[PDB]
Enzyme design. Sequence first.
Site, PDB file in Angstrom:
ATOM      1  NE  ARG A   1       6.240  38.919  45.012  1.00 13.62           N
ATOM      2  CZ  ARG A   1       5.890  38.832  43.735  1.00 13.62           C
ATOM      3  NH1 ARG A   1       5.440  37.694  43.228  1.00 13.62           N
ATOM      4  NH2 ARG A   1       5.984  39.901  42.963  1.00 13.62           N
TER       5      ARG A   1
ATOM      6  CE  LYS B   1       8.362  43.227  40.535  1.00 11.83           C
ATOM      7  NZ  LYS B   1       7.516  42.395  39.652  1.00 11.83           N
TER       8      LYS B   1
ATOM      9  CE1 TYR C   1       9.927  35.530  37.858  1.00 17.57           C
ATOM     10  CE2 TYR C   1       9.176  36.489  39.918  1.00 17.57           C
ATOM     11  CZ  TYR C   1       9.205  35.421  39.036  1.00 17.57           C
ATOM     12  OH  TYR C   1       8.534  34.271  39.341  1.00 17.57           O
TER      13      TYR C   1
ATOM     14  CG  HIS D   1       9.439  40.688  33.332  1.00 13.27           C
ATOM     15  ND1 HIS D   1       9.563  40.755  34.725  1.00 13.27           N
ATOM     16  CD2 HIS D   1       8.664  39.625  33.082  1.00 13.27           C
ATOM     17  CE1 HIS D   1       8.930  39.750  35.280  1.00 13.27           C
ATOM     18  NE2 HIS D   1       8.362  39.048  34.295  1.00 13.27           N
TER      19      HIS D   1
ATOM     20  CD  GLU E   1      12.353  37.633  33.347  1.00 12.13           C
ATOM     21  OE1 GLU E   1      12.242  37.809  34.594  1.00 12.13           O
ATOM     22  OE2 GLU E   1      13.258  38.147  32.650  1.00 12.13           O
TER      23      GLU E   1
ATOM     24  CG  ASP F   1       0.452  38.342  33.976  1.00 10.12           C
ATOM     25  OD1 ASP F   1      -0.754  38.080  34.227  1.00 10.12           O
ATOM     26  OD2 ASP F   1       1.297  37.478  33.678  1.00 10.12           O
TER      27      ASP F   1
ATOM     28  CB  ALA G   1      -0.313  42.908  37.346  1.00 10.82           C
TER      29      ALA G   1
ATOM     30  CG  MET H   1      -4.446  38.172  41.891  1.00  3.29           C
ATOM     31  SD  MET H   1      -5.653  37.029  41.106  1.00  3.29           S
ATOM     32  CE  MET H   1      -4.862  37.060  39.515  1.00  3.29           C
TER      33      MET H   1
HETATM   34  N1  LIG Z   1       1.078  38.257  38.562  1.00 10.51           N
HETATM   35  C1  LIG Z   1       0.091  37.372  38.405  1.00 10.51           C
HETATM   36  O1  LIG Z   1      -1.122  37.585  38.722  1.00 10.51           O
HETATM   37  C2  LIG Z   1       0.677  36.150  37.740  1.00 10.51           C
HETATM   38  C3  LIG Z   1       1.949  35.654  38.076  1.00 10.51           C
HETATM   39  C4  LIG Z   1       2.419  34.545  37.367  1.00 10.51           C
HETATM   40  C5  LIG Z   1       1.636  33.956  36.340  1.00 10.51           C
HETATM   41  N2  LIG Z   1       0.398  34.427  36.034  1.00 10.51           N
HETATM   42  C6  LIG Z   1      -0.460  33.955  34.912  1.00 10.51           C
HETATM   43  O2  LIG Z   1      -1.314  32.818  34.849  1.00 10.51           O
HETATM   44  C7  LIG Z   1      -1.803  32.867  33.461  1.00 10.51           C
HETATM   45  C8  LIG Z   1      -1.927  31.500  32.773  1.00 10.51           C
HETATM   46  O3  LIG Z   1      -0.632  30.881  32.752  1.00 10.51           O
HETATM   47  P1  LIG Z   1      -0.366  29.303  33.081  1.00 10.51           P
HETATM   48  O4  LIG Z   1       0.949  29.139  33.748  1.00 10.51           O
HETATM   49  O5  LIG Z   1      -1.561  28.523  33.614  1.00 10.51           O
HETATM   50  O6  LIG Z   1      -0.196  28.915  31.494  1.00 10.51           O
HETATM   51  P2  LIG Z   1      -0.110  27.382  31.003  1.00 10.51           P
HETATM   52  O7  LIG Z   1       0.751  27.511  29.750  1.00 10.51           O
HETATM   53  O8  LIG Z   1       0.352  26.517  32.146  1.00 10.51           O
HETATM   54  O9  LIG Z   1      -1.627  26.999  30.622  1.00 10.51           O
HETATM   55  C9  LIG Z   1      -2.359  27.837  29.758  1.00 10.51           C
HETATM   56  C10 LIG Z   1      -3.426  26.987  29.094  1.00 10.51           C
HETATM   57  O10 LIG Z   1      -4.164  27.802  28.175  1.00 10.51           O
HETATM   58  C11 LIG Z   1      -4.619  26.950  27.144  1.00 10.51           C
HETATM   59  N3  LIG Z   1      -5.150  27.727  26.010  1.00 10.51           N
HETATM   60  C12 LIG Z   1      -4.512  28.360  24.977  1.00 10.51           C
HETATM   61  N4  LIG Z   1      -5.414  28.942  24.173  1.00 10.51           N
HETATM   62  C13 LIG Z   1      -6.649  28.675  24.669  1.00 10.51           C
HETATM   63  C14 LIG Z   1      -8.051  28.958  24.367  1.00 10.51           C
HETATM   64  N5  LIG Z   1      -8.367  29.659  23.281  1.00 10.51           N
HETATM   65  N6  LIG Z   1      -9.048  28.521  25.197  1.00 10.51           N
HETATM   66  C15 LIG Z   1      -8.769  27.804  26.295  1.00 10.51           C
HETATM   67  N7  LIG Z   1      -7.521  27.480  26.643  1.00 10.51           N
HETATM   68  C16 LIG Z   1      -6.465  27.882  25.895  1.00 10.51           C
HETATM   69  C17 LIG Z   1      -3.381  26.101  26.851  1.00 10.51           C
HETATM   70  O11 LIG Z   1      -3.671  24.934  26.100  1.00 10.51           O
HETATM   71  C18 LIG Z   1      -2.889  25.785  28.278  1.00 10.51           C
HETATM   72  O12 LIG Z   1      -3.430  24.556  28.832  1.00 10.51           O
HETATM   73  C19 LIG Z   1      -0.770  33.624  32.606  1.00 10.51           C
HETATM   74  O13 LIG Z   1      -1.222  34.875  32.093  1.00 10.51           O
HETATM   75  C20 LIG Z   1       0.330  33.781  33.617  1.00 10.51           C
HETATM   76  O14 LIG Z   1       1.062  34.932  33.342  1.00 10.51           O
HETATM   77  C21 LIG Z   1      -0.035  35.543  36.696  1.00 10.51           C
END
Ligand SMILES: NC(=O)c1ccc[n+]([C@@H]2O[C@H](COP(=O)([O-])OP(=O)(O)OC[C@H]3O[C@@H](n4cnc5c(N)ncnc54)[C@H](O)[C@@H]3O)[C@@H](O)[C@H]2O)c1
Lengths: 371, 367, 366, 366
Positions: free
Chosen positions: A15, A74, A93, A95, A117, A269, A299, A301
């Site tokens: 990226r 990064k 980013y 963190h 973030e 992550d 992490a 993806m």
């Molecule tokens: N590097 C990567 O691979 C990368 C990069 C960015 C984001 N992500 C990840 O995607 C993942 C999810 O984030 P998002 O943006 O969709 O979050 P979001 O806040 O948009 O949605 C998360 C959902 O989880 C639900 N939830 C909470 N507790 C629950 C339970 N017990 N059972 C079922 N659902 C439940 C919430 O109600 C919500 O709808 C995160 O860990 C985020 O970090 C990963």
Amino acid sequence: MKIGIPKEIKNNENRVAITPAGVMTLVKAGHDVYVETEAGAGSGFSDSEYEKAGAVIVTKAEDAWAAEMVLKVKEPLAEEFRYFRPGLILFTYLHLAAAEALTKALVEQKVVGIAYETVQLANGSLPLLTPMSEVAGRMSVQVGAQFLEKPHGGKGILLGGVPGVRRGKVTIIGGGTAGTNAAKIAVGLGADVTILDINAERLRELDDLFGDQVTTLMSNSYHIAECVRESDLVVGAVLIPGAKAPKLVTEEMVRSMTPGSVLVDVAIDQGGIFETTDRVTTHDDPTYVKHGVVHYAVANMPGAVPRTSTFALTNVTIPYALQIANKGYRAACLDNPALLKGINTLDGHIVYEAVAAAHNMPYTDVHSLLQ
Amino acid sequence: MKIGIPKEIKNNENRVAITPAGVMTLVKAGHDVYVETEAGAGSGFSDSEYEKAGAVIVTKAEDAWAAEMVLKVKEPLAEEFRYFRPGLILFTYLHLAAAEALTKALVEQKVVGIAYETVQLANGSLPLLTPMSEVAGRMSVQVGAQFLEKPHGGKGILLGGVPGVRRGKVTIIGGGTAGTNAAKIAVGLGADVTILDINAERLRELDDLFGDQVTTLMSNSYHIAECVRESDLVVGAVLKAPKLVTEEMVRSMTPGSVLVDVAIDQGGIFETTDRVTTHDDPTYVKHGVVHYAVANMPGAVPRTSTFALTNVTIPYALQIANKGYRAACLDNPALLKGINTLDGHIVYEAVAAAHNMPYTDVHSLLQ
Amino acid sequence: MKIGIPKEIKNNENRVAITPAGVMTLVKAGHDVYVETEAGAGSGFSDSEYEKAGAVIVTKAEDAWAAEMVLKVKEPLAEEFRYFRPGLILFTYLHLAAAEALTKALVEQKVVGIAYETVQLANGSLPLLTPMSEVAGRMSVQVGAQFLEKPHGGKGILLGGVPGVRRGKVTIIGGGTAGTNAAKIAVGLGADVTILDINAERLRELDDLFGDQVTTLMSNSYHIAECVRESDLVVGAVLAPKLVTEEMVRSMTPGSVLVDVAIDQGGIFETTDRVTTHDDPTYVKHGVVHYAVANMPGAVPRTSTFALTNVTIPYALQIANKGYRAACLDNPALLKGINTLDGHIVYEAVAAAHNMPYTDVHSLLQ
Amino acid sequence: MKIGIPKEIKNNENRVAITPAGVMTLVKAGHDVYVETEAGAGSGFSDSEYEKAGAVIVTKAEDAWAAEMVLKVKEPLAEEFRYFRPGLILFTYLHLAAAEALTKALVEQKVVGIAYETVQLANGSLPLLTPMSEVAGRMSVQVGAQFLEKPHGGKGILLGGVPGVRRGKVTIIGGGTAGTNAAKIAVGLGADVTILDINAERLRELDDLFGDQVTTLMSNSYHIAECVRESDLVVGAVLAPKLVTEEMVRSMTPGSVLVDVAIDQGGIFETTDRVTTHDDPTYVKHGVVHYAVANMPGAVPRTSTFALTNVTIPYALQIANKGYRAACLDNPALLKGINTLDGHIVYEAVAAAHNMPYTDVHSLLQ
Ligand SMILES: NC(=O)c1ccc[n+]([C@@H]2O[C@H](COP(=O)([O-])OP(=O)(O)OC[C@H]3O[C@@H](n4cnc5c(N)ncnc54)[C@H](O)[C@@H]3O)[C@@H](O)[C@H]2O)c1
Ligand SMILES: NC(=O)c1ccc[n+]([C@@H]2O[C@H](COP(=O)([O-])OP(=O)(O)OC[C@H]3O[C@@H](n4cnc5c(N)ncnc54)[C@H](O)[C@@H]3O)[C@@H](O)[C@H]2O)c1
Ligand SMILES: NC(=O)c1ccc[n+]([C@@H]2O[C@H](COP(=O)([O-])OP(=O)(O)OC[C@H]3O[C@@H](n4cnc5c(N)ncnc54)[C@H](O)[C@@H]3O)[C@@H](O)[C@H]2O)c1
Ligand SMILES: NC(=O)c1ccc[n+]([C@@H]2O[C@H](COP(=O)([O-])OP(=O)(O)OC[C@H]3O[C@@H](n4cnc5c(N)ncnc54)[C@H](O)[C@@H]3O)[C@@H](O)[C@H]2O)c1
């Protein structure tokens, strides 16, 4: 303003923090844009595409870091702390919370460290993280389908089957940005798709978005155990926006699964939602097997699709960069309460409360320092 | 009839020529079914499931081949000619026109050699090949999307992009079974999809099946060049296939673009595919473009492929068991076209012609 | 209350400020409704359908204007000033910032001038403008399709092609009401459709609404340049900056078509220097067909009449039930409709525009 | 073989008998291709795109006609007879049953006259007419939508309405190629759509193809009367009986619109007494807008050129590779294309129509 974009040095980071499009936006609003040679090459952006958009290609990393604002993707690494000046604007980013050598160095060198973030709208959403959840969600089921193939360790099925053959079963745990995007791909590959969430209103929105293409299901330990038992693929897509990810899938649930089923924990992550995810995997070493079940927990993806990932991230960072460039970081942050929540370090102080709080370091309220 | 299903021994062949459900169909019709231990393991069918459906598990390949009719997926290897014997019924993918040694051994041991792939309906369709073109089509775009990722050597895009970001472009050359099935998966991943075919009526049918989800486009060299130049993924899905995609066209593509051919073990449509790869080492790059050259994509999903194949092979096998091969083929003109070798003769013209060996009229031997 | 609907008299204005269904709502709530003969003819509503719903048909415009409240679509023309009188309630599209003579006549005659277009909900939306945005959006691509035909000056393609033949490419700039509604028609005619918006959240909502039927693309001068170069049809639906430059139009293929929903508001195309009418509707610059006819909802007056009166008559009902004063003190959105009251301009922008005194409306209503 | 494509010279004919892609197919198979300058301009194909595909551009029509095989779209006009010569291969839409002078000139000059429209597959289908049926179907509803706008004489509705506003009603009579393609555009513009067909099996196939997007209705004079009375737009797509009577049109609401795909073939409407042109395209009878412009594919010449040449050039390739005789003995569909050969009429209907001798084509080809 003079705006600098150095190449990402962190290993297999493909990226970049600007496109020819974002170059042309900053150039046309009167700014000087310097891009380190080869910065865009990981994402298919040649030096000549950046040039014709109006940017100056510089030969050396220091000539990009030279500029008043450094745009990056990064964290700056050990080797990059050197380049920090007083009143350098860094937007990437960061963190800082678990990066102490980075935080002291931005404190000590009086850099204005602005974090992707922590930029945050009044409804509390983080516009600058959403795109990476979208990319990770879409990737989650593509990766799941690859691991379902016998050669990669899976039971050897297509999610969509074929005429006269049953489809695979996909359970998505979490119905927010990542999970919704994962469900779109699982529907499109022809899977029987169940999405779980705790929020009944999100379930109603998912029912409006998908109709009969998915089943929406209230999340509780019983429903999760029932879905996991019968799943070919389980996508972990829960966020508790502060916390570590909750452990929603137990070892006993994973052991109830058929051999060569797949787990993809998008939530890794933040520590991940599977009890059996004992470590972080890599694009190079994506999986291990526990109880006959393939576990994937990469992490970054979105690092796998840097060209898509870069567009999606810079679509929404460059508008905040333009404000800082046009008006100076100070007027732009007073004018934009969401950009302001981005300031992580300013004039030697740690102005973000949770990062000072996690490094045992002083916390100086950001507003007093700006007026 | 006594029916035998040995384990497939070809390297990494994980399909099997019967499932517990097919065992049950044959046992309920009064036939004895013998499955070699572990024959279904690679497709996720345990000895125990086969036994519960009414099969006898045998410890040795030899005991499955001892059956009056042997069902397989692949052609017998040289090391299996030993099991051939006069009057053995063998029903499998034979591809005898490419295999002089196997042909001669089936002739020498007077095997009733019935090829899945020459069973042919009155309308010309090959019903025991179709299921493998369907799986191959569905796999082609899944594999292409995987090779689009930067880690696998591609340019690093999602075919569906994300909100605010353009989609990948997929060109499918060929709108038959494999291509139609590829287009379903490319639409599902969110690509901009163009399907080329030479047949106007098939483009109208594709327009009825997909409507606005795809663009249907008449196949000629100009339109192929135009689509290939702007493609992130090209799928070859034409049935010895002509070389529709030239070196000049591949060289026009952006780097980290991907080519996949359903037809690669029959040459395929790309000039630049000089060889077949395996799942171990699946691609090579030419002119910065990823060439996925693995043959037998269905072999990567052996469980789905085993269900798809055995869904249509077992009903034919049931006719041979109930009636004997002779009445079954005289009652079923499609099954009759399956007979390649009989009582020491080659009765399939194209196999006789491929090896310059004597041809015999099948009806004259059956009477 | 006595409520009058004159026939619209602006040239080719075929819309009307009420339908039989709106008559029926007002008559059942006990009001007297007077409709000028032929008022609804241009939108296919006979004098007779109005009568059966309980209206009185009046032969003369004078007799419709003599009502206590006059419902109209367009602004009164100079020759309608003669109908103004102290305490008249006029509810219509006024656009007073652009109409000094009209503004001065409403002040001098002490008319209660309520503007459809300044009625405003708490969320900022203008619920009485929205329906014309929807109609103009739907119309924009239908017009584009027409101008892509050769006998109208276009390159001669169908947007959806045919089997074996490539589709037209439609770029929609702006993903709001008009641009979303345009995208629905572009998709349905079988175009390859790209929608640009600066707002990432709108792009997500558009992705939720259209999924694979369209591509959503972040707006910036580079994405716009690239989309415009490839487009058969560009629909401007932004709310008005010059996002599409002359260099961008010059990059286009001859017989491509530009349509702005925003035309009488300036529009987004540097090359649209003027507005046209249905008898000479286009001009060509750099071989590109510029469609420049204002007020596309005017071309479907029946549809537009229903869409407008659907949301205007509930506000009229409030005025008639309670009188304008209590209707406005009870309904803050309707309060913002008031532009003139007892000889005062009570809408700051309009006062500014004509260098006239502004009065706070709350002070006059007490 | 040397293959010539003259520019179409009939008034406003903007289609062309080849594209650069068809040039490329013929040149790569080793033929010489000559295109008259400007032949493709009306369909957006420059002389230059033809040259890069390997054609030779010729300044004069004479030089395109001097080729051994001439590809055209329309029938040669009187002033093109001068180009005929013994052994010329002419492949075009001929319609000789309707053209005595053309037929006599093809006989006298011993032209091999191959008609696009009599090429016929074993199943009876006319694969070189089909694509114009598809284009006309898609066009029919786009034109209908245009004529429902008030400034064009219509009642002034959008077919899809808007939120809160009823949709237009579209009746399609005939569920074949044209009527199916019309239904796709009616559905996409958001109309309420009824398709009638006499064939129950076609109605089932239509139900499979459209499901809940349309209603399928068995055709009979009663269902037709009921649909027509309620319709905003009626599309005639039958292949030509008078299914829609004057009483049925009289039952319609004023500013409704009738379009026949079948217009130059008579059409299904008793009230369409004549054909019109794009400069006076409609007439009104009983307040209903009759659209009577022939050859709607002519309005999208680029789309129509691609759709036709997609299926014509494979047949031309066969003629050029093998010569007409072996191409026709090898391809029974192409054999049925032959209407004139070595001074004989070899198509019975055409001979009948002009009271001329018929000869069996097989006897001449031997
Ligand atoms: N590097 C990567 O691979 C990368 C990069 C960015 C984001 N992500 C990840 O995607 C993942 C999810 O984030 P998002 O943006 O969709 O979050 P979001 O806040 O948009 O949605 C998360 C959902 O989880 C639900 N939830 C909470 N507790 C629950 C339970 N017990 N059972 C079922 N659902 C439940 C919430 O109600 C919500 O709808 C995160 O860990 C985020 O970090 C990963
Ligand atoms: N394991 C496997 O991958 C597997 C198994 C069985 C068969 N196959 C192979 O699949 C391939 C194709 O499969 P299918 O089921 O789509 O075939 P199919 O017989 O259903 O039809 C192929 C299509 O390609 C079209 N075509 C022919 N020439 C063309 C051209 N020049 N340009 C464009 N289109 C053209 C035809 O009109 C047809 O619609 C074959 O080569 C066959 O050997 C593969
Ligand atoms: N007579 C009529 O035709 C009539 C009547 C009423 C309204 N309108 C017109 O409708 C038009 C807009 O209608 P609407 O209600 O859809 O607007 P809207 O405000 O609902 O949406 C405008 C959209 O444009 C986006 N935008 C802003 N700047 C942009 C840029 N540079 N590039 C791309 N997108 C950008 C916004 O994020 C927003 O989503 C106006 O121009 C107005 O004049 C016309
Ligand atoms: N220049 C042009 O516009 C052009 C070019 C080529 C063809 N066409 C026209 O296309 C028209 C038809 O095209 P097509 O290919 O769709 O025809 P088609 O034969 O494919 O279909 C005709 C349909 O009408 C149905 N039908 C017969 N009698 C009926 C009745 N009383 N009521 C309802 N349905 C009835 C049939 O069952 C059939 O399904 C023709 O009239 C022809 O002239 C026009």
